A and B are shown apart, each in its own frame.
Chain A
Amino acid sequence: ADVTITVNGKVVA
């Protein structure tokens, strides 16, 4: 790919 997007997230109780 030309650009790599890393998406970070979290699910909390």
Chain B
Amino acid sequence: FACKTANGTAIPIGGGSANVYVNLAPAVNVGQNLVVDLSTQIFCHNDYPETITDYVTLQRGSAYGGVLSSFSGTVKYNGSSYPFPTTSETPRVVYNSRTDKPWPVALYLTPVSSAGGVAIKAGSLIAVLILRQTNNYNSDDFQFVWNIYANNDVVVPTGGCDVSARDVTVTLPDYPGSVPIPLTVYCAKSQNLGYYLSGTTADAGNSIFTNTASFSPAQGVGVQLTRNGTIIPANNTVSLGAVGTSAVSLGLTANYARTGGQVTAGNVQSIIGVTFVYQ
């Protein structure tokens, strides 16, 4: 019995450890968020199927790593779901062929936010999975330890909803003028969703974000966002109603707004956060 990754990295007879480098494509699902499907990444086979049958389980102590360590979830093993990190050995998968066959493991994260996310840097450890292999022939009891690494920079969603982009940059026309902000949100199932803006504001109405341009800044102007032609104050819930699998545009537009005093030439920049909330 031996195993290999999609990229040819092998663990031989007797077990051992290997790194698995995965191009992650995490996604929200109903009730759980996919982190990584390893059934396309890890393969094993029985070396002598005519006389021996191999038994393969996911062993207790399999867990997330790095920045996913604070989160709990589920693991789907051979069509059934179990708590993850694993607290008990799973039922077995039978390996009875010399032909490589997937190790049927997929990792999920339990939603805890509305539309939050955890940023993963490429090269980061995201999970450690313990494959236990025994057989019906002798007393072999081997461990195949799979260290799962993110191959790419990615955001793992932690909520029931996800966004078109986690960072959006827009350029306004030269003062005066406006520009739409492309930003949509969708949810795995229907959610009563809203959002609020965050940032430093200049006015008592809490609706004009300050100009924080560092180099050659303009004076006298800030940035104000509108939705449906209506100014959106910061720290105030905008209701999107019920949001489902079809993406819904937040309908945001950026504008300049005078903050007082002389308007002098220079650069303008405002950094504005969006945070979603269940209502």
Could you write out 25 A-B pairs with CB less than 8 Å apart?
A: A1-B198, A2-B274, A3-B166, A3-B275, A4-B167, A5-B170, A5-B181, A6-B270, A7-B170, A7-B172, A7-B179, A7-B209, A7-B269, A7-B272, A8-B169, A8-B172, A8-B268, A9-B171, A9-B173, A9-B175, A9-B223, A10-B174, A11-B218, A12-B174, A12-B265
Tell me whether B171 and A8 are in contact (CB under 8 A).
yes
Tell me whether A4 and B174 are in contact (CB under 8 A).
no
Contacts of A12 in B (CB 8 A): 174-175, 265
Q: Is B248 an interface residue (CB 8 A)?
A: no
Tell me whether B268 and A3 are in contact (CB under 8 A).
no
Q: Of all chain A residues, which has the CB nearest B169? A: A6
Assuming the A-B contacts A1-B274, A5-B271, are A10 and B266 also in contact, with contact meaning beta carbons closer than 8 angstroms in the complex? yes
Q: How many residues of A contact B (CB 8 A)?
A: 13
Contacts of A11 in B (CB 8 A): 174-175, 218, 220-221, 263-266, 268
Contact of A2 among B163, B223, B252, B269 (CB under 8 A): B163
CA distance A7 to B175 in the complex (A): 13
CA distance A8 to B163 in the complex (A): 21
Q: Is B183 an interface residue (CB 8 A)?
A: yes
Contacts of A1 in B (CB 8 A): 198, 273-275
- Residues of A participating in the B interface, judged by any CB pair closer than 8 Å: 1-13
Q: Is B256 an interface residue (CB 8 A)?
A: yes
Q: Is the interface of B mostly helix, strand, loop or mixed?
A: strand
Q: When each residue 219-232 of chain B gets 1 if its CB lies under 8 Å from chain A and 0 otherwise, what string results?
A: 01101000000000
Q: Is B95 an interface residue (CB 8 A)?
A: no
- List B residues 255-269 near A (Cβ within 8 Å): 256, 263-269
14 other contacts beyond A10-B175, A12-B174, with CB at 8 A cut-off? A1-B273, A2-B114, A2-B115, A2-B274, A5-B169, A5-B170, A5-B252, A5-B271, A7-B270, A7-B272, A8-B171, A11-B218, A11-B266, A13-B265
